[PDB]
Design an enzyme around this catalytic site. Structure first.
Site, mmCIF file in Angstrom:
data_model
loop_
_atom_site.group_PDB
_atom_site.id
_atom_site.type_symbol
_atom_site.label_atom_id
_atom_site.label_comp_id
_atom_site.label_asym_id
_atom_site.label_seq_id
_atom_site.Cartn_x
_atom_site.Cartn_y
_atom_site.Cartn_z
ATOM 1 C CG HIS A 327 -8.208 8.279 -14.484
ATOM 2 N ND1 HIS A 327 -7.389 7.178 -14.616
ATOM 3 C CD2 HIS A 327 -8.423 8.431 -13.156
ATOM 4 C CE1 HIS A 327 -7.113 6.691 -13.419
ATOM 5 N NE2 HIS A 327 -7.729 7.433 -12.516
ATOM 6 C CG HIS A 356 -12.237 -0.221 -8.458
ATOM 7 N ND1 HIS A 356 -11.197 -0.810 -7.770
ATOM 8 C CD2 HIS A 356 -11.968 1.105 -8.481
ATOM 9 C CE1 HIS A 356 -10.346 0.122 -7.381
ATOM 10 N NE2 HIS A 356 -10.791 1.293 -7.800
ATOM 11 C CD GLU A 357 -13.411 4.177 -10.056
ATOM 12 O OE1 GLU A 357 -13.666 5.170 -9.342
ATOM 13 O OE2 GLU A 357 -12.258 3.715 -10.191
ATOM 14 C CD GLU A 384 -8.149 3.086 -5.379
ATOM 15 O OE1 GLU A 384 -8.329 2.013 -5.981
ATOM 16 O OE2 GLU A 384 -8.623 4.172 -5.774
ATOM 17 C CD1 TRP A 459 18.086 2.828 -8.556
ATOM 18 C CD2 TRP A 459 16.657 3.297 -6.899
ATOM 19 N NE1 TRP A 459 16.812 2.674 -9.045
ATOM 20 C CE2 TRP A 459 15.916 2.956 -8.049
ATOM 21 C CE3 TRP A 459 15.968 3.630 -5.728
ATOM 22 C CZ2 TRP A 459 14.524 2.939 -8.064
ATOM 23 C CZ3 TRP A 459 14.585 3.614 -5.745
ATOM 24 C CH2 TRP A 459 13.879 3.269 -6.905
ATOM 25 C CE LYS A 463 14.182 -0.578 -8.883
ATOM 26 N NZ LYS A 463 12.821 -1.021 -9.290
ATOM 27 C CG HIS A 487 3.598 7.628 -7.605
ATOM 28 N ND1 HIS A 487 3.547 7.223 -8.922
ATOM 29 C CD2 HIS A 487 2.402 7.297 -7.063
ATOM 30 C CE1 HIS A 487 2.370 6.674 -9.166
ATOM 31 N NE2 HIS A 487 1.657 6.707 -8.055
HETATM 32 ZN ZN LIG Z 1 -9.994 2.971 -6.826
#
Ligand SMILES: [Zn+2]
Ligand SMILES: *[C@@H]1O[C@H](CO)[C@@H](O)[C@H](O)[C@H]1NC(C)=O
Ligand SMILES: *[C@@H]1O[C@H](CO)[C@@H](O)[C@H](O)[C@H]1NC(C)=O
Ligand SMILES: *[C@@H]1O[C@H](CO)[C@@H](O)[C@H](O)[C@H]1NC(C)=O
Length: 600
Positions: A327, A356-357, A384, A459, A463, A487
């Site tokens: 990853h 990006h990194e 981010e 929910w 939705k 999450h």
């Molecule tokens: Zn990132």
């Protein structure tokens, strides 16, 4: 003597102790991520224990110093962040029970299986098997049993655990003087004192609600275009005025619509720009990719990577069967030890990921001089956002021509640009209602506005109304569909993916005016503009030393999140969608479902 004098010496000792223990914890975790071995899990777990035991002792001792007696703002910010407690405030039995429920929900999500109703021996985990169905299958019934089975077999196991989770977490937050666990999470955006740079926890609710009402016109036209294209892909399965079936959206949940792109390419004869072959034809390797990413940041006035980055980073997979986590991640281990770990291949996607990194590393390098507790993004969404805007400029045809990956005579095509913008919107725009509605449901559940007997009822009502997505099968309160996402089952706040997206286009628009970009925003390349990089570095060096409203103001001149830059980026697509939806209904009724064909 004074309370501020005692806390200033307390914070100094804390910083040097935290510097050493957090470094060993990051180094040990790095040594595992680059060398998966049971021994490296043990040494990593020892480093986490000492560091966590140290932080708990220091956090409790920080409560000795009353903030009201601290006057200096920097000492006040560090103390407040350290006084903030978590699960330690609960009694030992409730604390043990909450940890038991957290471990249970996480293992159920990572080991639970759904079995094929037609082939009962085939039972698939989510991450390998069920994701493959939900991300690549074009069959209505195969996606259905994966979507339904994942929620009926795994989601129902999580329902009783999540109900006790809400009650225990709400008690934890209230013992920390918050209203509920939702008010606790919104404290991540709280900024307490300043010159109008303050930010109440309740203010996040309004800014999210206000920015969302401005997103709805663009999303509905994206929704209307996707619906008309999904009716062709699934004939007689989707109503032209109704909601989109939840199991046909490109993943297990409808979080991103990226994987729907091959079903709805606006101009299928124009292939998207892909510079992989030019990379291979010019004999690029992973080192060249990061040297080019390094050159990009130098062009904007930022420094080179440190010598430690080049000597200690794992830029390629080792290949001696050293089992490795691939990853892509950017590491700030502390002590000016910056590293990137990613199994880089000579592709355009990894080329964009490298920029990006490295943008994460540039951020880390900028606030290196700040005290330990203040070495982070201005808030949870800043890091981010900084990384994403780097990928925006590096992928532009203008920047690819300047580095020789596109021919100097390369001519741009509007149909190709529309193909690019739609694919971007399926990823960027499609997730905003999903993210907003998911967090709104969690906020209302934590507050108690949605009783447990109405969890699943509210929910899917939300939705249908907010996201324009309808469940393919009716789900009663034995289900817990939100817990079927990583999450939710693993106790992570989710609004950051909303705010990060708003922030990144605010940053991009601001820096692109400084870079003197003319024309549509999506074509902007901030390369070679030292004024753009110097302005961005003004904010990056703050870390978390100043309020996030202040840090945002330093780059974009505005103190709060603003979605108009995002809409500006997608304005050319908005114009194309409106003309394509001229003979299509825009909006949706919430009365239709695939278990019931009615419109009222
Ligand atoms: Zn990132
Ligand atoms: C990987 O880990 C093993 C066992 O912990 C160790 O013997 C070996 O030297 C490590 N390799 C590297 C390159 O660190
Ligand atoms: C800052 O505090 C004032 C005082 O009432 C309040 O009116 C204002 O809304 C606050 N700003 C934010 C962004 O929360
Ligand atoms: C980055 O490294 C290159 C290669 O040596 C050098 O020419 C350039 O001046 C360096 N930039 C900075 C800001 O140190």
């Amino acid at each position: 003597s004074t309370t501020e004098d005692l806390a200033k010496t307390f914070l100094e000792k804390f910083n040097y102790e935290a510097e050493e223990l957090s470094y060993q914890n990051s180094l040990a975790s790095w040594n595992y991520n680059t060398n998966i071995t049971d021994e490296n899990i043990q040494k990593m777990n020892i480093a986490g224990a000492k560091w966590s035991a140290f932080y708990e002792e220091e956090s409790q001792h920080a409560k000795t110093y009353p903030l009201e007696e601290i006057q200096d703002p920097i000492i006040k910010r560090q103390l407040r962040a350290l006084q903030q407690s978590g699960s330690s405030v609960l009694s030992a039995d409730k604390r043990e029970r909450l940890n038991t429920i957290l471990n249970a929900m996480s293992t159920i999500y990572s080991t639970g299986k759904a079995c094929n109703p037609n082939n009962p021996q085939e039972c698939l985990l989510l991450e390998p098997g069920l994701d493959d169905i939900m991300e690549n299958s074009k069959d209505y019934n195969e996606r259905l049993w994966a979507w339904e089975g994942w929620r009926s077999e795994v989601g129902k196991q999580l329902r009783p655990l999540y109900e006790e989770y809400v009650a225990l977490k709400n008690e934890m937050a209230r013992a920390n003087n918050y209203e509920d666990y939702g008010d606790y999470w919104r404290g991540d955006y709280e900024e307490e004192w300043a010159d109008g740079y303050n930010y109440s926890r309740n203010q996040l609710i309004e800014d999210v609600e206000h920015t969302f009402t401005q997103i709805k016109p663009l999303y509905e036209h994206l929704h209307a275009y996707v619906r008309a294209k999904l009716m062709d892909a699934y004939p007689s399965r989707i109503s032209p005025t109704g909601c989109l079936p939840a199991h046909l959206l490109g993943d297990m949940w409808g979080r991103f619509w990226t994987n729907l792109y091959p079903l709805m390419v606006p101009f299928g004869q124009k292939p998207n720009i892909d510079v992989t072959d030019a990379m291979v034809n010019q004999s690029w390797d992973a080192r060249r990719i990061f040297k080019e990413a390094e050159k990009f940041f130098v062009s904007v006035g930022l420094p080179n990577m440190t010598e430690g980055f080049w000597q200690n980073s794992m830029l390629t997979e080792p290949g001696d069967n050293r089992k490795v986590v691939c990853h892509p991640t950017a590491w700030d281990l502390g002590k000016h030890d910056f590293r990137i770990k990613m199994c880089t291949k000579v592709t355009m996607d990894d080329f964009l990921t490298a920029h990006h990194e490295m943008g994460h590393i540039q951020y880390d390098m900028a606030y290196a001089a700040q005290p330990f507790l203040l070495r982070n993004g201005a808030n949870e969404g800043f890091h981010e956002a900084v990384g994403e805007i780097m990928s925006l400029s590096a992928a532009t045809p203008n920047h690819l021509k300047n580095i020789g990956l596109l021919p100097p005579d390369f001519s741009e095509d509007s149909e190709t640009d529309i193909n690019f913008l739609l694919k971007q919107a399926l990823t960027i725009v499609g997730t905003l209602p999903f993210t907003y509605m998911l967090e709104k449901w969690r906020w209302m559940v934590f507050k108690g506005e949605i009783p447990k007997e109405q969890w699943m009822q509210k929910w899917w009502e939300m939705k249908r109304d907010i996201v324009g997505v309808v469940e393919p099968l009716p789900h009663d309160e034995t289900y817990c569909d939100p817990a079927a996402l990583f999450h939710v089952a693993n106790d992570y706040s989710f609004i950051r993916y909303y705010t990060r997206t708003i922030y990144q286009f605010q940053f991009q628009e601001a820096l692109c005016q400084i870079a003197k970009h003319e024309g549509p925003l999506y074509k902007c390349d901030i390369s070679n503009s030292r004024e753009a990089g110097q302005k961005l570095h003004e904010m990056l060096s703050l870390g978390r030393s100043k309020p996030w409203t202040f840090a945002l103001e330093r780059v974009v001149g505005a103190k709060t999140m603003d979605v108009r830059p995002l809409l500006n980026y997608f304005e050319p697509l908005f114009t194309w969608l409106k003309e394509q939806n001229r003979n299509s209904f825009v909006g949706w009724n919430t009365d239709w479902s695939p278990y019931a064909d009615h419109h009222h």
